[PDB]
Design an enzyme around this catalytic site. Sequence first.
Site, PDB file in Angstrom:
ATOM      1  N   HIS A  61      10.025   7.505 -86.294  1.00 42.83           N
ATOM      2  CA  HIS A  61      10.277   7.422 -84.856  1.00 42.83           C
ATOM      3  C   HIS A  61      10.289   8.850 -84.291  1.00 42.83           C
ATOM      4  O   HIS A  61       9.652   9.114 -83.275  1.00 42.83           O
ATOM      5  CB  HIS A  61      11.658   6.731 -84.583  1.00 42.83           C
ATOM      6  CG  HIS A  61      12.101   7.066 -83.183  1.00 42.83           C
ATOM      7  ND1 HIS A  61      12.964   8.086 -82.796  1.00 42.83           N
ATOM      8  CD2 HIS A  61      11.668   6.532 -82.012  1.00 42.83           C
ATOM      9  CE1 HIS A  61      13.032   8.121 -81.456  1.00 42.83           C
ATOM     10  NE2 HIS A  61      12.163   7.291 -80.982  1.00 42.83           N
ATOM     11  N   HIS A  91      18.255  14.230 -82.553  1.00 48.40           N
ATOM     12  CA  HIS A  91      16.805  14.034 -82.607  1.00 48.40           C
ATOM     13  C   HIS A  91      16.265  14.311 -81.205  1.00 48.40           C
ATOM     14  O   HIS A  91      17.027  14.516 -80.255  1.00 48.40           O
ATOM     15  CB  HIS A  91      16.449  12.583 -83.053  1.00 48.40           C
ATOM     16  CG  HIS A  91      16.978  11.559 -82.108  1.00 48.40           C
ATOM     17  ND1 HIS A  91      18.293  11.061 -82.181  1.00 48.40           N
ATOM     18  CD2 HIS A  91      16.438  10.976 -80.994  1.00 48.40           C
ATOM     19  CE1 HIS A  91      18.517  10.241 -81.159  1.00 48.40           C
ATOM     20  NE2 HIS A  91      17.399  10.198 -80.363  1.00 48.40           N
ATOM     21  N   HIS A  93      12.975  13.181 -78.232  1.00 44.65           N
ATOM     22  CA  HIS A  93      11.820  12.417 -77.782  1.00 44.65           C
ATOM     23  C   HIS A  93      10.928  13.389 -77.016  1.00 44.65           C
ATOM     24  O   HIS A  93      11.416  14.304 -76.364  1.00 44.65           O
ATOM     25  CB  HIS A  93      12.245  11.274 -76.844  1.00 44.65           C
ATOM     26  CG  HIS A  93      13.328  10.391 -77.412  1.00 44.65           C
ATOM     27  ND1 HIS A  93      13.059   9.100 -77.862  1.00 44.65           N
ATOM     28  CD2 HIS A  93      14.647  10.604 -77.617  1.00 44.65           C
ATOM     29  CE1 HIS A  93      14.207   8.570 -78.334  1.00 44.65           C
ATOM     30  NE2 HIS A  93      15.191   9.475 -78.210  1.00 44.65           N
ATOM     31  N   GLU A 103      13.259  10.680 -71.725  1.00 46.44           N
ATOM     32  CA  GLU A 103      13.634   9.270 -71.504  1.00 46.44           C
ATOM     33  C   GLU A 103      14.328   9.138 -70.145  1.00 46.44           C
ATOM     34  O   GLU A 103      13.884   8.399 -69.271  1.00 46.44           O
ATOM     35  CB  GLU A 103      14.494   8.824 -72.697  1.00 46.44           C
ATOM     36  CG  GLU A 103      13.693   8.875 -73.964  1.00 46.44           C
ATOM     37  CD  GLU A 103      14.171   7.885 -74.992  1.00 46.44           C
ATOM     38  OE1 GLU A 103      15.362   8.004 -75.392  1.00 46.44           O
ATOM     39  OE2 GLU A 103      13.367   7.007 -75.444  1.00 46.44           O
ATOM     40  N   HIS A 116      18.799  14.437 -78.040  1.00 44.56           N
ATOM     41  CA  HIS A 116      19.944  13.510 -78.081  1.00 44.56           C
ATOM     42  C   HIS A 116      20.810  13.936 -79.256  1.00 44.56           C
ATOM     43  O   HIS A 116      20.408  13.823 -80.436  1.00 44.56           O
ATOM     44  CB  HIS A 116      19.407  12.098 -78.324  1.00 44.56           C
ATOM     45  CG  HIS A 116      18.771  11.574 -77.083  1.00 44.56           C
ATOM     46  ND1 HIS A 116      17.880  10.483 -77.075  1.00 44.56           N
ATOM     47  CD2 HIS A 116      18.878  12.010 -75.787  1.00 44.56           C
ATOM     48  CE1 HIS A 116      17.469  10.265 -75.847  1.00 44.56           C
ATOM     49  NE2 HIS A 116      18.059  11.171 -75.009  1.00 44.56           N
ATOM     50  N   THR A 195      18.265   3.799 -76.958  1.00 40.79           N
ATOM     51  CA  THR A 195      16.950   3.709 -76.300  1.00 40.79           C
ATOM     52  C   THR A 195      15.847   3.258 -77.242  1.00 40.79           C
ATOM     53  O   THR A 195      14.680   3.116 -76.832  1.00 40.79           O
ATOM     54  CB  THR A 195      16.562   5.050 -75.676  1.00 40.79           C
ATOM     55  OG1 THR A 195      16.282   5.942 -76.750  1.00 40.79           O
ATOM     56  CG2 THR A 195      17.597   5.581 -74.695  1.00 40.79           C
ATOM     57  N   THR A 196      16.198   3.005 -78.504  1.00 45.04           N
ATOM     58  CA  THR A 196      15.294   2.419 -79.478  1.00 45.04           C
ATOM     59  C   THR A 196      15.886   1.108 -79.967  1.00 45.04           C
ATOM     60  O   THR A 196      17.116   0.938 -79.945  1.00 45.04           O
ATOM     61  CB  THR A 196      15.111   3.283 -80.741  1.00 45.04           C
ATOM     62  OG1 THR A 196      16.381   3.422 -81.390  1.00 45.04           O
ATOM     63  CG2 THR A 196      14.617   4.669 -80.400  1.00 45.04           C
TER      64      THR A 196
HETATM   65  N1  LIG Z   1      17.802   7.511 -78.532  1.00 47.18           N
HETATM   66  S1  LIG Z   1      19.333   7.230 -78.828  1.00 47.18           S
HETATM   67  O1  LIG Z   1      20.111   8.449 -78.718  1.00 47.18           O
HETATM   68  O2  LIG Z   1      19.820   6.074 -78.079  1.00 47.18           O
HETATM   69  C1  LIG Z   1      19.559   6.854 -80.549  1.00 47.18           C
HETATM   70  C2  LIG Z   1      20.876   6.739 -81.048  1.00 47.18           C
HETATM   71  F1  LIG Z   1      21.886   6.730 -80.174  1.00 47.18           F
HETATM   72  C3  LIG Z   1      21.130   6.683 -82.355  1.00 47.18           C
HETATM   73  F2  LIG Z   1      22.399   6.556 -82.774  1.00 47.18           F
HETATM   74  C4  LIG Z   1      20.126   6.710 -83.341  1.00 47.18           C
HETATM   75  C5  LIG Z   1      18.775   6.792 -82.902  1.00 47.18           C
HETATM   76  C6  LIG Z   1      18.571   6.861 -81.532  1.00 47.18           C
HETATM   77  F3  LIG Z   1      17.273   6.979 -81.143  1.00 47.18           F
HETATM   78  N2  LIG Z   1      17.729   6.909 -83.837  1.00 47.18           N
HETATM   79  C7  LIG Z   1      16.467   6.158 -83.819  1.00 47.18           C
HETATM   80  C8  LIG Z   1      16.386   5.043 -84.889  1.00 47.18           C
HETATM   81  C9  LIG Z   1      17.481   3.980 -84.643  1.00 47.18           C
HETATM   82  C10 LIG Z   1      17.461   2.752 -85.560  1.00 47.18           C
HETATM   83  C11 LIG Z   1      17.330   2.915 -87.074  1.00 47.18           C
HETATM   84  C12 LIG Z   1      16.043   3.436 -87.721  1.00 47.18           C
HETATM   85  C13 LIG Z   1      14.748   3.200 -86.961  1.00 47.18           C
HETATM   86  C14 LIG Z   1      14.168   4.275 -86.023  1.00 47.18           C
HETATM   87  C15 LIG Z   1      14.949   4.499 -84.716  1.00 47.18           C
HETATM   88  C16 LIG Z   1      18.027   7.716 -85.038  1.00 47.18           C
HETATM   89  C17 LIG Z   1      19.056   6.961 -85.909  1.00 47.18           C
HETATM   90  S2  LIG Z   1      20.596   6.787 -85.038  1.00 47.18           S
HETATM   91  O3  LIG Z   1      21.396   8.008 -85.216  1.00 47.18           O
HETATM   92  O4  LIG Z   1      21.220   5.546 -85.353  1.00 47.18           O
HETATM   93 ZN   LIG Z   2      17.159   9.332 -78.597  1.00 41.16          ZN
END
Ligand SMILES: NS(=O)(=O)c1c(F)c(F)c2c(c1F)N(CC1CCCCCCC1)CCS2(=O)=O
Ligand SMILES: [Zn+2]
Length: 257
Positions: A61, A91, A93, A103, A116, A195-196
Amino acid sequence: HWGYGKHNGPEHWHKDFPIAKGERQSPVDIDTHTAKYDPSLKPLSVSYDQATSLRILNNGHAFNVEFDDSQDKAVLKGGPLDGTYRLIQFHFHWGSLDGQGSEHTVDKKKYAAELHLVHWNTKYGDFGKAVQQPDGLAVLGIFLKVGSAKPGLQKVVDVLDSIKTKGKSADFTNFDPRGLLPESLDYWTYPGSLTTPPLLECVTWIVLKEPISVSSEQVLKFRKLNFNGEGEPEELMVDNWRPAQPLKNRQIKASFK
Ligand SMILES: NS(=O)(=O)c1c(F)c(F)c2c(c1F)N(CC1CCCCCCC1)CCS2(=O)=O
Ligand SMILES: [Zn+2]
């Protein structure tokens, strides 16, 4: 199978994750004129001096820098939060072009990327429990515009060729996330979601007003990454952003006038 393509992108996610059409989905457009200043909001407290980074992971991702979250080492407090939230990972985007990739948007403006920093509410004991709660996570979002380099991002940039494909990781110790923060901690906040997929409605969003600048070369290195695993057809990891979702019955609050 979800992703960001024509046949499995954001438009499709509701079929496997019906909450995609829920009442507190993220991201959203931040209409700066209609966000309400709330003089009762506190300053954010970002305590990252004892952060212990462990590893950087390409999870198909994005790329993800993970931290030791088994003690209160790096925490977020204050702001709109009533609890103490522990940093677990960050991470980004980003886009295929400098004019898209964020986003959240601000008065419909898109940034080149969005950082994020994910934190979970320690009253729930583990991250897996916290994502099941409406106040489980606090995600600090920081916009990236293209201009002068961000020196504190370069160590991240430089290791990306070692995690080009899905499932690759690398040791990533002694990284200081304070090098990714802008000067001001003025912020907007609202209740929202991941957001995923799985799009869980567990996030208090705190989005900083001030972007950071990164160079065109730094963001170009993000775009070299791959969504695919090694040995599979190459698909560049770009445009891994969900567009703005309906605000519905929510108010965005500002910490500043
Ligand atoms: N964009 S966001 O900030 O709302 C968001 C978030 F809050 C997360 F907590 C996580 C995200 C993520 F984007 N990710 C993306 C993952 C979430 C689901 C598990 C593995 C599949 C890829 C996407 C990293 C792992 S994670 O740390 O669980
Ligand atoms: Zn994110």
